């Protein structure tokens, strides 16, 4: 068998970013910034021909309804996609395609983003081509409306329609061949891997058959004999018949418990305590780190589509807590870390549901997408926040070192190091703390990289609130004066 859960990064780089609904021209430009800040790669929105939905006007979710496997999408043309992949690969920042293989469109008919028609009522997709024989139907799904209802029934979850999305027959050799041709075309252009959408709704054996058809990566950039990187979106918070552990033999799996648990802890929901993170990871009932793709939020659950609705998951709308959770995730050693990168929208929670959760990316109309301008109130650019990218640098310097020198106060303050490379103190209490601890670091003067620009003096004050330098004594102990409130954490580390 082939295993696909191993990614490939340039030395010093590891973290990936979901540039949600970014155009190809903007990602191509961003790859220089990403390389300079030693990110490893970018998850891109579905790049194949997708539905154009005009009621409501051009929602983000139209891109999760494929119309064909041509490569003209809201983010740009096939030419712009290949320009992006070439430029990014040449910079050592790789591309992971959001691959939508479980389904085509919902009901109704229309014209996709590349001019091909679709008809969900007659199951006709002439741009592929698919017809009714290529879909699950009444022979495979016994629910009255043909949709999924009982998530304790794996056959229903995998053969019925997710919210009416016409469900492809992944057991058929024709569908397996067509979908592998799509993936291999993108690998041939230089794509490094795939975020596979809706994997809980597909049979592992069908995924195995598709992945077995894949070509290895393009040796213009990648080592000879290297499998594509595959991570699978499987939503598994327990209490269902489909499990994340069914998919880990194929590749990595999205661990949604990770963001649920860190969200509840940092929010202090129902008496949670930051000190409980002392054993965070697989010991919390999660996937092993080697099999997991981890993240604080993603494009679905920042819109309330995850467990709890709103109130557990942390997003850029809860920026201070979001930064605390992301800093912990980046400083810890658990999973392949993905950072969400978002756009603003008029989130309007009524009875626990966002009435405006459909709104697409910043647009001037007609279904276009604006050019990105970070921090303009429309593009959030979390990956460009100093607290984020400086903790990515911390994460990179710490690579290969275990967690060491753990301390906690029993409640909402913790601290720990990564070997002799970095140390972080997180004060989620409502009072200030002065505490001397073994940091494990060599004696010297360090800057707090949460508030400052650099890791050593001169610390750099581009954010205006760079804290006083931290002195690590000869014995490695440092005295941490850590305040409560905004950015209530100090992180120090050595040079690469
Ligand atoms: Ca299915
Ligand atoms: Cl995901």
- Structure tokens given for 351: 């009875």
Closest of 422, 416, 425 to residue 393, by C-alpha: 422
- Structure tokens given for 126: 């002439």
CA distances from 403 to 156, 245, 278, 287, 407 (A): 43, 26, 10, 18, 11
- How much distance in Å is there from the Cα of 247 to the middle of ligand 1? 15
Which residues are CB-contacts of 385 (< 8 A; sequence separation ≥ 6)? 323
Q: How many other C-beta atoms are found inside a 10 Å radius of the C-beta of residue 107?
A: 11
Q: Does residue 484 lie within any of the structural domains?
A: no
Cis amide bond preceding 384, omega within 30? no
What 3 state SS string does 195-236 have? EECCHHHCCHHHHHHHHCCCCCCCCCCCCCCCCCEEEECCCC
- Smallest-distance ligand from the CA of 163: 1
Q: Does residue 3 lie within any of the structural domains?
A: no
In the sheet where 433-438 sits, what is the strand order? Answer: 433-438, 477-482, 470-472, 444-446
Q: Kindly state the DSSP code that residue 139 receives in the 8-state scheme.
A: T
Q: Residues within 5 Å of ion ligand 1 by Cβ?
A: 102, 158, 167, 201
- Determine the structural domain holding residue 93 and report its residue range: 18-398
Question: Is residue 201 part of an annotated ligand binding site?
Answer: yes
SS3 of 377, please?
Answer: coil
Closest of 11, 190, 208, 196 to residue 102, by C-alpha: 196
- Smallest-distance ligand from the CA of 96: 2
Question: Is residue 159 part of an annotated ligand binding site?
Answer: no
- How much distance in Å is there from the Cα of 451 to the middle of ligand 2? 30
Q: What is the Cα–Cα distance from 392 to 390, expressed in whole angstroms?
A: 5
Q: Does residue 380 lie within any of the structural domains?
A: yes
- Smallest-distance ligand from the CA of 202: 1
Q: Does residue 421 lie within any of the structural domains?
A: no
347, 356 in Cβ contact below 8 A? yes
In b/e form, how buried is each residue of 412-431, taking b as 16+ CB within 10 angstroms?
Answer: bbbbbbbbbbbbbbbbbeee
Q: Does residue 438 lie within any of the structural domains?
A: no
139, 199 in Cβ contact below 8 A? no
Which residues are CB-contacts of 458 (< 8 A; sequence separation ≥ 6)? none
- How much distance in Å is there from the Cα of 157 to the middle of ligand 1? 7
- How much distance in Å is there from the Cα of 94 to the middle of ligand 2? 17
In the block, tokens 């966002």 appear at: 354
Q: Which helix (H) or strand (E) holds 405?
A: strand 403-408
Number of domains the chain is built from: 1
Q: Does residue 393 lie within any of the structural domains?
A: yes
- How much distance in Å is there from the Cα of 250 to the middle of ligand 2? 16
- Structure tokens given for 115: 């001019």
Question: Is residue 149 part of an annotated ligand binding site?
Answer: no
Which residues are CB-contacts of 306 (< 8 A; sequence separation ≥ 6)? 235, 256, 259, 260, 300, 312, 313
397, 421 in Cβ contact below 8 A? yes
Q: Kindly state the DSSP code that residue 124 receives in the 8-state scheme.
A: B
- Smallest-distance ligand from the CA of 136: 1
Q: Does residue 487 lie within any of the structural domains?
A: no
Residue numbers preceding breaks in the chain (C to N > 2.5 A): none
Question: Is residue 158 part of an annotated ligand binding site?
Answer: yes
Closest of 58, 54, 24, 56 to residue 42, by C-alpha: 24
- Smallest-distance ligand from the CA of 200: 1
Q: Kindly state the DSSP code that residue 125 receives in the 8-state scheme.
A: B
For 407-468, the DSSP string reads EE-SSSEEEEEETTTEEEEEE-SSS-EEEEEE--SPSEEE--TTTSSSSSSS---TTS-PPP
Crossing angle of helices 78-90 and 24-36, rounded to 10°: 10
Method: X-ray
Q: What is the CATH number of the domain that holds 135?
A: 3.20.20.80
Q: Does residue 2 lie within any of the structural domains?
A: no
293, 193 in Cβ contact below 8 A? no
Q: What is the Cα–Cα distance from 18 to 16, expressed in whole angstroms?
A: 7
- How much distance in Å is there from the Cα of 165 to the middle of ligand 1? 9
- Structure tokens given for 292: 């997991």
SS3 of 291, please?
Answer: helix
What is the greatest pairwise CA distance in the chain? 75
What residues form DSSP beta bridges with 76? 73
What residues form DSSP beta bridges with 159? none
Q: Is 467 exposed, middle or buried (0-12, 13-18, 19+ CB in 10 A)?
A: middle
183, 99 in Cβ contact below 8 A? yes
SS3 of 304, please?
Answer: coil
Closest of 277, 268, 323, 273 to residue 296, by C-alpha: 323
What is the CA 198 to chain-centroid distance, rounded? 14
At residue 452's C-alpha, the angle toward residues 451 and 453, to 5°, is 135
- How much distance in Å is there from the Cα of 343 to the middle of ligand 1? 30
Closest of 469, 414, 472, 474 to residue 439, by C-alpha: 472
């Amino acid at each position: 068998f082939q295993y696909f859960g191993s990614y490939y990064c340039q030395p010093g780089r590891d973290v990936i970013v979901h540039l949600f609904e970014w155009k190809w021209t903007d990602i191509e430009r961003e790859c220089q910034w990403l390389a300079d800040h030693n990110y490893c790669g970018v998850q891109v929105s579905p790049p194949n021909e997708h539905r154009i939905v005009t009621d409501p006007p051009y929602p983000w979710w139209q891109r999760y309804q494929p119309v064909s496997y041509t490569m003209n999408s809201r983010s740009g043309s096939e030419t712009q996609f290949r320009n992006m992949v070439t430029t990014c690969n040449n910079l050592g920042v790789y591309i992971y395609v959001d691959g939508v293989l479980n389904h085509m469109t919902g009901g109704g008919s229309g014209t996709g983003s590349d001019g091909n028609s679709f008809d969900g009522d007659s199951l006709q997709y002439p741009g592929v081509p698919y017809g009714p024989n290529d879909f699950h139907g009444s022979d495979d799904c016994s629910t009255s409306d043909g949709e999924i209802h009982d998530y304790n029934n794996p056959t229903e979850v995998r053969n019925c329609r997710l919210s009416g999305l016409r469900d492809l027959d992944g057991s058929a050799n024709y569908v397996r061949d067509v979908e592998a041709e799509f993936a291999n075309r993108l690998i041939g252009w230089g794509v490094a891997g795939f975020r596979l959408d809706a994997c809980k709704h597909m049979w592992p054996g069908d995924l195995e058959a598709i992945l077995g058809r894949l070509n290895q990566l393009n040796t213009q950039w990648f080592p000879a004999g290297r499998n594509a990187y595959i991570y699978q979106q499987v939503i598994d918070l327990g209490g269902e018949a489909v499990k994340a552990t069914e998919y880990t033999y194929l590749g990595r799996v999205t661990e949604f418990k990770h963001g649920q648990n860190l969200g509840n802890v940092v929010r202090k929901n129902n008496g949670q305590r930051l000190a409980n993170l002392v054993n965070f990871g697989e010991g919390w009932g999660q996937l092993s780190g080697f099999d997991a793709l981890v993240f604080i939020d993603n494009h679905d659950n920042q819109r309330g589509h995850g467990a709890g609705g709103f109130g557990t998951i942390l997003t850029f709308f809860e920026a201070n807590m979001y930064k605390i959770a992301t800093a912990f995730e980046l400083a810890w050693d658990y999973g392949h870390v993905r950072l969400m990168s978002s756009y603003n929208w008029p989130r309007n929670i009524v009875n626990g549901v966002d009435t405006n959760d459909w709104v697409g990316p910043p647009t001037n109309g007609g279904g276009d997408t604006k050019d990105v301008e970070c921090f303009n109130g429309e593009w959030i650019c979390e990956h460009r926040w100093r607290e984020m990218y400086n903790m990515v640098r911390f994460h990179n310097v710490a690579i290969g070192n275990p967690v060491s020198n753990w301390w906690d106060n029993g409640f909402q303050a913790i601290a720990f190091g990564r070997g002799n490379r970095g140390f972080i103190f997180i004060n989620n209490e409502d009072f200030a703390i002065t505490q001397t601890l073994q940091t494990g670091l060599p004696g010297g003067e360090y800057c707090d990289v949460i508030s400052c620009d650099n890791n050593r003096p001169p610390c750099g004050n581009s954010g205006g609130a760079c804290r006083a330098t931290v002195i690590v004594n000869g014995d490695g102990t440092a005295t941490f004066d850590v305040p409560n409130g905004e950015n209530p954490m100090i992180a120090i580390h050595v040079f690469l």
